[PDB]
Amino acid sequence: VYYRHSNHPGGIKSITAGELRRTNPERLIENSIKGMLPSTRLGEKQGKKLFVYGGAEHPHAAQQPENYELRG
Amino acid sequence: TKGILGRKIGMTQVFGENGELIPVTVVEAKENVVLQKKTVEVDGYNAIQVGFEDKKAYKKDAKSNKYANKPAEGHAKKADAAPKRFIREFRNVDVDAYEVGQEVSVDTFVAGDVIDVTGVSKGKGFQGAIKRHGQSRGPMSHGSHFHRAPGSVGMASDASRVFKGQKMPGRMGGNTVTVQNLEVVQVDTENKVILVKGNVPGPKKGLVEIRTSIK
């Protein structure tokens, strides 16, 4: 389950992992990237170099992007 | 569904056949015309744009809102129309009807229809907690020293702050309100007014919107 509070009394909301992946999966991936970065102002800037898309199609052809393969 | 646009006039009463006393608000809807048709292919959603009563023409040294400026004078020239004083969108309607420039008459509504009315409340100013939240004004005698003040604002050193939405004094109300499930009593087309059974938000000669009730 994911949680968030609105600073309003009794205002805790929630959502489970599967249905967050089923609706807005981009948020699912970028949240867990950004939780793995420093929480400085430089780190929050470095999280802005990230673009996530559901489905295999993106607009960034002028930047000439290269394929990278996970070197685990 | 339907929807036209407004400016209430006042309240009166009308006698119902079979014998009744029916209090009614007189809403005058003249000078409406479709100005623009939003479409899902170009705008992402379907809606029509309507202008209620018309204003003057663009004048050289014109500075009050009584005349139209260059941009709004250019708008609604595409619609073959005069400049309007109010423009609101209706996305509860079927956009395949409504040719752009169509004059929406006041007799789109038939006596018997169930309608929704929205408007803006009357603006009471700055009020405190008795008037605005309906509190209790503790005792007036027996040595008492609190009359219209509010009580405590929280607990003690545990949770040592005030919570959100704590209902203090402030500006009373000039808000947006919608009264659901009212009724059309009569559609008078010579004078172009509508009789609505009941009360309407706002002062006299303020703008109102009328719509087919969703439920």
Partner: protein, 113 residues
Amino acid sequence: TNHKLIEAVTKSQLRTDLPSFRPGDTLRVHVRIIEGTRERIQVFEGVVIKRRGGGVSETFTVRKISSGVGVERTFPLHTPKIEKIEVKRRGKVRRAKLYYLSLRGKAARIQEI
């Protein structure tokens, strides 16, 4: 003064049948009571004590004891439950609101003609 749309759209339901009242007149009012299916008429008789308003929302009030207990009866000038108005007497007063009347017996501390 209200608005020409307010008189225009209620102007039809005015009834041009009734006599001319003055507070202090005695009238007998012929009102129409409905049932299973028979529109019975019953008659209220009394002195007029107040008239307020204008236009369609006019109103008047007539007072009657008739049983030992005073009774008030207030009703619209143009309501269609009224079959006719009969002015019984005229009477001369000095006020427009005959409020001067604890009430029982003959302790109606009012003035008549």
